[PDB]
Structure formats: C-alpha cells, structure tokens
Write a protein that binds this ligand. Structure first.
Ligand SMILES: CC(=O)N[C@H]1[C@@H](OP(=O)(O)OP(=O)(O)OC[C@H]2O[C@@H](n3ccc(=O)[nH]c3=O)[C@H](O)[C@@H]2O)O[C@H](CO)[C@@H](O)[C@@H]1O[C@H](C)C(=O)N[C@@H](C)C(=O)O
Ligand SMILES: [Mg+2]
Length: 446
C-alpha cells in the first residue's frame, strides 16, 4: 500500500470537504477522500465532478489514514473519533480547511468566533470593508468555505470561525481576532466549559491584535497584554475602547471620548445589537477601515435572516423567526429583547436537539414574558422539565402544528417567537430551513 510522500486525505465529504477537494485538485496534489457514512451528502457531487478521486465511505480504516502526511478533517466530525486519535498518535497532522487557509492566505485575516453573534458581526465587518472600498472576501463557518475565497488580489479576509474549526487550526496568525462571547453550547462535543473555551481561544494563536468583550471574561486572551487590544462594551469607554456615551438619556456609539453615532440612527435595535456594532467597529478600526465608511455601513445594516426577523402580523399578533437561536444564551436574549418591546406577551416556540444544554436559565424569562410555550423536537421534555409550571406548555410534533397552535394561544398585542434554544438537526437540514418552514407555516395561517 505505497503512497506519494505528499499524500493527504480529506476526512469528511460535506461542504468543506468539497472545498478541500477543489483546492488539492487544483494544485495537482495526491489525495483521497474518506467519510464515516456510507452515503455522505456530497458523495453524489464528488462522483459527478471528480470521478477519478479515490473515495472510501464507511468505518474509517486507521491504517489508511496513517499513510497520509496530514488529514483535513470536517469540523463536524469529532476529533475523538478513534481512527483520528490513532492517526494523531502516529504523528499524522490533524488539520482542516481553516488551518490550511491560514497557511496559504496572503492578506490580513479578521477572525471572529463566539457562541453567538459571530455571523452578524462577520457580515457587518464585511460590509464595512466593502464600504471602505477594500477588496474583501468574507466566509468560513458563515457559509462560503474559506479555501474558495483565496485569491492573490484580496486585500482583507473576514472569517467567521467555529470552535470546531479552531480545534484543528495550529496557528491562525490572524491580523485581529475576537471571541465575541462564550455561553454554554456544543456540550454534545465538549466535556465541559473548559475544553470549549480552550478551543475558541485557539483563535488567538499568533494573533497580531485582539478585540475583547469587556462584559465577558471568557473572551479575554493572555496575549491582550502583549499585542494591541481593543475592547468593546456598553459602558462608557476608556482609552483604546469602544462603548456608549450617554448624555441626557441619549446614547451614542463611541470610541474613547468621541461620540461616533447616536444609537437611534442604527436600523438594528437593543443592547445586543449595540454591542455587535461596537465589536464590528473595533475589528474594522484594527485593520484600518475609516470611521466614516464603517459608520455608513452600520447605518445601512439591516440584520440577517432568521435573527428575530419579523414575518407577519395577523389579528394583532406579530410572528418572529429567530431560528438562529440554537443555544440558551440566544433564546434568552430574544425573549428578553422582544418581550420588552411588545405591547403584549410572548408565545415561544422552542425545542429540537438541545446538545446536552442546561435549560434552567430559560425559566425566569419565560415566567416574566411568556403567555405560553410550544415545545417540539427531541429534547422538548428536557425543556419542559426546566420550565416547570411557569406558564402553560403545549407539546406538538411538527413545526406546522407548532405555528397553528401558537396562533391559537396568542392574543392581540402578543408576539409568536421561534427562538428554539436548540439545534435544528433532529428534524431539519439546518436552522435556515427551520426558519423558512416556520415562515411558510406562518404565511399559511388564514
Ligand atoms: C457542522 C459544521 O461544522 N458545519 C460546517 C461545515 O459544513 P460541512 O458541510 O463541511 O459539515 P461537516 O463538517 O461535514 O459536518 C456535517 C455533519 O457531517 C457529519 N460527518 C462528517 C464527516 C464524516 O466523516 N462523518 C460524519 O458523520 C458530522 O458529524 C456532522 O454531523 O463547513 C461549512 C463551511 O466552513 C460551515 O458553514 C458549516 O457550518 C454550519 C453553518 C454549522 O452548523 N456550523 C456549526 C459548527 C455551528 O455554527 O455551530
Ligand atoms: Mg455553534
């Protein structure tokens, strides 16, 4: 079983695996593809587009993996998979598409992770860079695989990174890096908060600057003492800091003692979105984006689909798609934020794959803001146990039923909120499909 000394193996045939196939094939390197599943989602794609690439589907063959110089592992595949552990112990480098991107990119990287907000802040910094007339490429976990962004004329890369991707990134060497926030998530993969936190802090390896959340200690890296450190927060900022300046009850986004923009001139609203705006300003300022360009993009920014997104108002009841809420921290923010905005109470739709999360933090906000909760999905029962008898709970089987029942529970002035605190993967392809099907059911109400 001979192989070339450059031989490498792509482990996982999903979207990032296909970006690795494209990259390695373009460089004419010897490689093969494996996947633990008999019928991975991009198998048909690989067979149609790369009929000559060796592909092995099923139980991983550790002896085959051990013949490669490096494995590029799908971020969704746990590195505790036994054959990967065995290859690692025999000195095979465990890598991945972000690790490879970091080793190849020829322009500064803005690297953004966090338990929440990383897609919004990544998108915003990208729009700031476009407004600053930079040749920018934006992607990563956000959707466009990072390797597909590579081009020599790119002046700035903006990457959303997951804790999973970061586990195989040896030395990202970002120009500026941030962990926006950390709250319990992905506890079906990590043993606890310590390993989850450590994985995210790999974003700082080699970072030339950092952006830190003054309100979240799990975002503060050791290197904040040795590289330029820009902080954001909602309190009044000090030197080198972004924050809010308040005068006669009017709030301004601010850098040090300079008022930048009244928060009322943003389209996005609420404390979490102000924090996101300040984080994006800090990241953009770190890579030289002019303030006037950044503020113009901030004023124009409308937010992302499935982020507490208004769908419909029917019989005085408004319907909001917050399907992006796949952890408790996100649902907490939406319940508090929308609950405080409306002239009524919430009917919350929640449940799905809870990833081993503690749901106890939902109880008090649900008791304060909800008229009822509609629960679906694999871990509906765990959520119901955490909520107790705070409010009426209605158990349903499908999202269409959940919407029909929520309409019946709601009264004029209420809002129906899909903010599930769970992954969608037990019942849906992804959280975007979950949100699209919620919006479809809402639109089908008579
Ligand atoms: C799960 C994950 O990390 N997905 C990211 C990945 O998409 P990709 O299609 O390559 O997925 P993947 O890494 O193959 O994982 C998908 C699923 O396949 C399974 N899988 C994968 C390989 C394999 O051999 N066997 C197997 O069972 C994984 O366990 C997982 O359940 O690469 C894309 C490009 O970088 C990302 O946009 C996408 O992020 C999505 C948005 C996501 O859900 N990310 C998670 C981490 C999140 O945000 O929490
Ligand atoms: Mg995640």
């Amino acid at each position: 079983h001979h192989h070339h000394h450059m031989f490498r193996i792509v482990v996982g045939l999903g979207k990032s695996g296909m970006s690795l196939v494209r990259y390695l094939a373009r460089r004419g390197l010897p490689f093969a593809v494996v996947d633990t599943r008999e019928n991975p989602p991009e198998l048909a794609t690989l067979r149609a587009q790369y009929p000559q690439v060796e592909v092995r589907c099923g139980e991983l063959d550790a002896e085959f993996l051990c013949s490669a110089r490096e494995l590029y592992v799908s971020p969704g595949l746990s590195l505790r998979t036994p054959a990967l552990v065995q290859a690692a112990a025999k000195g095979v480098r465990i890598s991945g598409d972000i690790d490879l991107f970091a080793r190849e990119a020829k322009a500064p990287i803005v690297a953004i992770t966090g338990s929440n907000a990383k897609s919004t802040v990544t998108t915003l910094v990208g729009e700031m860079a476009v407004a600053a007339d930079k040749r920018v490429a934006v992607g990563g976990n956000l959707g466009t695989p990072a390797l597909d962004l590579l081009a020599d004329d790119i002046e700035l890369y903006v990457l959303e990174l997951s804790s999973f991707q970061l586990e195989t990134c040896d030395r990202l060497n970002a120009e500026v890096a941030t962990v926006l926030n950390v709250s319990e998530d992905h506890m079906d993969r990590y043993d606890g908060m310590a390993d989850y936190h450590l994985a995210k802090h790999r974003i700082f390896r080699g970072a030339r600057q950092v952006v830190v959340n003054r309100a979240d200690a799990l975002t503060r890296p050791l290197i904040a003492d040795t590289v330029p450190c820009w902080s954001f927060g909602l309190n009044k900022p000090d030197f080198k800091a972004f924050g809010l300046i308040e005068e006669d009850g009017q709030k301004w986004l601010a850098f040090q003692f300079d008022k930048l923009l009244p928060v009322g001139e943003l389209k996005i609203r609420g404390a979490h979105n102000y924090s996101n705006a300040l984080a994006a300003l800090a990241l953009g300022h770190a890579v030289g984006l002019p303030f006037d360009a950044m503020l113009g993009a901030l004023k124009a920014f409308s937010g992302l689909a499935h982020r507490c997104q208004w769908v419909r108002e029917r019989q005085g009841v408004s319907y909001y798609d917050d399907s992006k809420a796949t952890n408790v921290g996100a649902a907490l923010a939406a319940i508090e934020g929308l609950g405080a905005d409306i002239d009524g109470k919430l009917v919350l739709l929640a449940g799905g794959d809870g990833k081993g999360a503690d749901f106890h933090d939902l109880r008090e906000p649900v008791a304060r803001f909800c008229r009822a909760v509609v629960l679906l999905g694999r871990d509906a029962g765990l959520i119901a146990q955490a909520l107790g008898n705070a409010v009426p709970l209605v158990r349903v089987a499908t999202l269409d039923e959940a919407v029909r029942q929520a309409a019946e529970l709601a009264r004029e002035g209420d809002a129906v909120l899909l903010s599930p605190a769970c992954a969608s993967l037990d019942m849906f392809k992804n959280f975007e499909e979950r949100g699209r099907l919620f919006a479809k059911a809402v639109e089908e109400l008579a």
